Amino acid sequence: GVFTFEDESTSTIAPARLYKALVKDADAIIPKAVEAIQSIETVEGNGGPGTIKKLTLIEGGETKYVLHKIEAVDEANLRYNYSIVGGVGLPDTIEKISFETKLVEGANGGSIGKVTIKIETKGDAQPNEEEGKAAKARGDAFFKAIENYLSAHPEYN
Per CB under 5 A, residues contacting Na ion are: 31, 35, 37
Q: With respect to Na ion, which residue has the nearer C-beta, 35 or 62? A: 35
Question: Among 76, 56, 75, 58, which residue's Cα sits nearest to residue 67?
Answer: 56
Locate all alpha helices (DSSP H) within 2-142, ordered by sequence.
Answer: 15-24, 26-33, 129-140
Q: With respect to Na ion, which residue has the nearer C-beta, 54 or 102? A: 54
Q: How far is CA 155 from the centre of its chain?
A: 22
Q: Show the CA angle centred on residue 32, arms to residues 129 and 73, nearest 5°.
A: 70
Shortest reach from residue 39's CB to Na ion, in Å: 8
Shortest reach from residue 87's CB to Na ion, in Å: 21
Question: Among 64, 62, 82, which residue's Cα sits nearest to residue 73?
Answer: 82
Shortest reach from residue 4's CB to Na ion, in Å: 30
Q: With respect to Na ion, which residue has the nearer C-beta, 38 or 77? A: 38
Binding-site residue ranges: 7, 31, 34, 37, 59, 68, 80, 82
